[PDB]
Amino acid sequence: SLPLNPKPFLNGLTGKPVMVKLKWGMEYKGYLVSVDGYMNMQLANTEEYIDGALSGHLGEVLIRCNNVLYIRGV
Amino acid sequence: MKLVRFLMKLSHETVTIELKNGTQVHGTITGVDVSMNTHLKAVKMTLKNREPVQLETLSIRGNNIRYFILPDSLPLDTLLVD
Amino acid sequence: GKSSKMLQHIDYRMRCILQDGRIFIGTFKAFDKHMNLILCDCDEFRKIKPKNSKQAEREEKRVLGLVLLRGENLVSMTVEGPPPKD
Amino acid sequence: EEEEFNTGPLSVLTQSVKNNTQVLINCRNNKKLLGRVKAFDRHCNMVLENVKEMWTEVPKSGKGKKKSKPVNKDRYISKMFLRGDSVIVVLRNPLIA
Amino acid sequence: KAHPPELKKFMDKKLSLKLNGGRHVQGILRGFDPFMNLVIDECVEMATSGQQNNIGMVVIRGNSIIMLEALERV
Amino acid sequence: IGVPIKVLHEAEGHIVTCETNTGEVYRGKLIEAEDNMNCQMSNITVTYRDGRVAQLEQVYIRGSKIRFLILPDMLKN
Amino acid sequence: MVQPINLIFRYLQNRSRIQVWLYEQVNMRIEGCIIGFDEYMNLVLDDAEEIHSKTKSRKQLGRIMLKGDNITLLQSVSN
């Protein structure tokens, strides 16, 4: 109902389990540790998923704004 | 925090550079800019699926630069200070 | 500080290889901060750069005149020789 | 500039250069470099030393009928500098220690 | 600095636009923005099979804008 | 101001060609040469990468998809 | 003179289901009701669903954040 921008959705989604998918077809699912202003983010306890199937958990991972395509709640 | 000043201060040193297109080029860098543009002279460049060729002048822009490997004996700890 | 690396190859015939794979050999008479080059007497060849070719030295060579190479598709450049008097 | 770089995602890389820990940087070229970055920048450009670069390749029609198998390749570098444009992701975890 | 695109002569005229990925649309330009974001009123996207689907007025970004062709007299 | 943008603005009024990143080469009178590489021509002949050529009464290509441009070299000398 | 940012703000305030096409990827697009947008083209879509035209499949993800660089064109939808 209320107007939720992308910066407020990224600030409210920090600390919770979400999934950030990139343009290359892969995605990182995990807890959002911190976010940046240039679309960059750092997650803790993240796992990689390619084609809807999990491959392995890497822990903390940093995704840039150019490589990250979208981010949703999980 | 500014790597352009560290890249421009490495002139006269021999290093290799592998761009995003898969081609490699090893030679002595003569000029480094703030935008990562590297100009060298008398460098040997070998592309992907091609033979090596020597160039007396080669200027690669910073937008096409993928990775650069300098020498292991270079003072990277002393050159990082501004 | 000096910026003479772009002015040293200015007015001379250079052969630059773009990101698309073509080789444009022409007199580099114009430059810019975005790497946009101006080639007077520029010839574009996409087959191979002729460097002592026994079978052929010019394959798929097209003359353009005043060519304007965009800096967004620039990959590398090479010097061929000095420019003419005219 | 320093507080946003230390508290944001770059602080996850800040433990890699400040603590001398190992991290894996993957790019769009299908290569992964494992090692510690000695210096970093705001544009994601990094410079490290003693990094192990590993990737995968194929024969590329070596038999003559488009038949090839995947093969892993690895190499070491005593010093290297990777730009921030070609960098895709960087993961910091307990791998170098 | 920060000048917009030349859309004053093509504004309110039925023309075709080429979007990235081989996309083709046709509509009336109801206005433009400084970041290349234009408004296409009565847009009809022509698919690769030959059929055209009318989607109405939409917003086209300037990043994937290939080229515009005026279908009327300017 | 760049030398290439000044050459593109000075190239208006004559016939020139512009090839995009997808191989589409549009040749015609340079009606509008913006500073952002936006090239607007009138009655331009556009030839795609497949070889088919067509004529447009008014075409306008943005500067983000500009590959190269060939104008007359008589004005440079 | 109807600008694209004003039309995007009106579509976000109306709460209608809009479909966004991917930039350089036309085989799959997104669809949903955007609640708000940002200055860098990033929007917050509520009930987002990725629709692939090649396979005819729809995968819903919920509240998603779409970046302005990945979306090339955005149109309106009835559903």
Curated annotation (Swiss-Prot), chain B:
Localisation per UniProt entry: Cytoplasm, Cytosol; Nucleus
Gene Ontology CC terms, in alphabetical order: catalytic step 2 spliceosome; commitment complex; cytosol; methylosome; nucleoplasm; nucleus; pICln-Sm protein complex; precatalytic spliceosome
Sufficient for interaction with CLNS1A as annotated region, ranges: 1-80
PTM text: Methylated on arginine residues by PRMT5 and PRMT7; probable asymmetric dimethylation which is required for assembly and biogenesis of snRNPs.
Chief localization: cytoplasm
GO biological process, one term: 7-methylguanosine cap hypermethylation
Assigned keywords, A-Z: Cytoplasm, Isopeptide bond, Methylation, mRNA processing, mRNA splicing, Nucleus, Repeat, Ribonucleoprotein, Spliceosome, Ubl conjugation
Family: Belongs to the snRNP core protein family.
The protein's role, per its UniProt record: Plays a role in pre-mRNA splicing as a core component of the spliceosomal U1, U2, U4 and U5 small nuclear ribonucleoproteins (snRNPs), the building blocks of the spliceosome. Component of both the pre-catalytic spliceosome B complex and activated spliceosome C complexes. As a component of the minor spliceosome, involved in the splicing of U12-type introns in pre-mRNAs. May act as a charged protein scaffold to promote snRNP assembly or strengthen snRNP-snRNP interactions through non-specific electrostatic contacts with RNA.
Anything else known: In the autoimmune disease systemic lupus erythematosus, antinuclear antibodies are developed with Sm specificity.
Protein name: Small nuclear ribonucleoprotein Sm D1
UniProt source species: Homo sapiens
Swiss-Prot record, chain D:
One of the protein's GO biological processes: spliceosomal complex assembly
Protein origin, superkingdom: Eukaryota
Compartments, record wording: Cytoplasm, Cytosol; Nucleus
SS bond list: none
Protein's UniProt keywords contain Cell division: no
A GO cellular-component term linked to this record: precatalytic spliceosome
Signal peptide: none
Keywords on record: Acetylation, Cytoplasm, Isopeptide bond, mRNA processing, mRNA splicing, Nucleus, Phosphoprotein, Ribonucleoprotein, Spliceosome, Ubl conjugation
Residues covered by the Sm domain: 10-96
GO molecular function annotations of the record: RNA binding
Family the UniProt entry places it in: Belongs to the snRNP core protein family.
Misc remark: In the autoimmune disease systemic lupus erythematosus, antinuclear antibodies are developed with Sm specificity.
Role this protein plays: Plays a role in pre-mRNA splicing as a core component of the spliceosomal U1, U2, U4 and U5 small nuclear ribonucleoproteins (snRNPs), the building blocks of the spliceosome. Component of both the pre-catalytic spliceosome B complex and activated spliceosome C complexes. As a component of the minor spliceosome, involved in the splicing of U12-type introns in pre-mRNAs.
Name of this protein: Small nuclear ribonucleoprotein Sm D2
Species whose genome carries this gene: Homo sapiens (Human)
Curated annotation (Swiss-Prot), chain E:
PROSITE patterns, sorted: SM
UniProt entry keywords in alphabetical sequence: Cytoplasm, mRNA processing, mRNA splicing, Nucleus, Ribonucleoprotein, RNA-binding, Spliceosome
Keyword Cytoplasm: yes
GO biological process, one term: spliceosomal complex assembly
Major location category of this protein: cytoplasm
Ranges where the Sm domain occurs: 2-74
Compartments where found: Cytoplasm, Cytosol; Nucleus
Domain of life of the native organism: Eukaryota
Single GO molecular function: RNA binding
GO cellular component assignments: catalytic step 2 spliceosome; cytosol; methylosome; nucleoplasm; nucleus; P granule; precatalytic spliceosome; small nuclear ribonucleoprotein complex
Subunit structure: Core component of the spliceosomal U1, U2, U4 and U5 small nuclear ribonucleoproteins (snRNPs), the building blocks of the spliceosome. Most spliceosomal snRNPs contain a common set of Sm proteins, SNRPB, SNRPD1, SNRPD2, SNRPD3, SNRPE, SNRPF and SNRPG that assemble in a heptameric protein ring on the Sm site of the small nuclear RNA to form the core snRNP. Component of the U1 snRNP. The U1 snRNP is composed of the U1 snRNA and the 7 core Sm proteins SNRPB, SNRPD1, SNRPD2, SNRPD3, SNRPE, SNRPF and SNRPG, and at least three U1 snRNP-specific proteins SNRNP70/U1-70K, SNRPA/U1-A and SNRPC/U1-C.
Family: Belongs to the snRNP Sm proteins family.
Protein name as catalogued: Small nuclear ribonucleoprotein G
Species name: Homo sapiens
From Swiss-Prot, chain G:
An example Gene Ontology molecular-function term: RNA binding
PROSITE patterns: SM (PS52002)
Tissue expression as described in the entry: Widely expressed. In scalp skin, it is present in the hair follicle, the epidermis, and the dermis.
One GO term of the biological process aspect: spliceosomal snRNP assembly
Gene Ontology CC: catalytic step 2 spliceosome; cytosol; methylosome; nucleoplasm; nucleus; pICln-Sm protein complex; precatalytic spliceosome; small nuclear ribonucleoprotein complex
Sm domain location: 5-79
Note: Patients with systemic lupus erythematosus produce antibodies which interact with snRNP proteins.
Function, in words: Plays a role in pre-mRNA splicing as a core component of the spliceosomal U1, U2, U4 and U5 small nuclear ribonucleoproteins (snRNPs), the building blocks of the spliceosome. Component of both the pre-catalytic spliceosome B complex and activated spliceosome C complexes. As a component of the minor spliceosome, involved in the splicing of U12-type introns in pre-mRNAs. As part of the U7 snRNP it is involved in histone 3'-end processing.
Sequence similarity: Belongs to the snRNP Sm proteins family.
Official protein name in the record: Small nuclear ribonucleoprotein E
Species assigned in the record: Homo sapiens (Human)
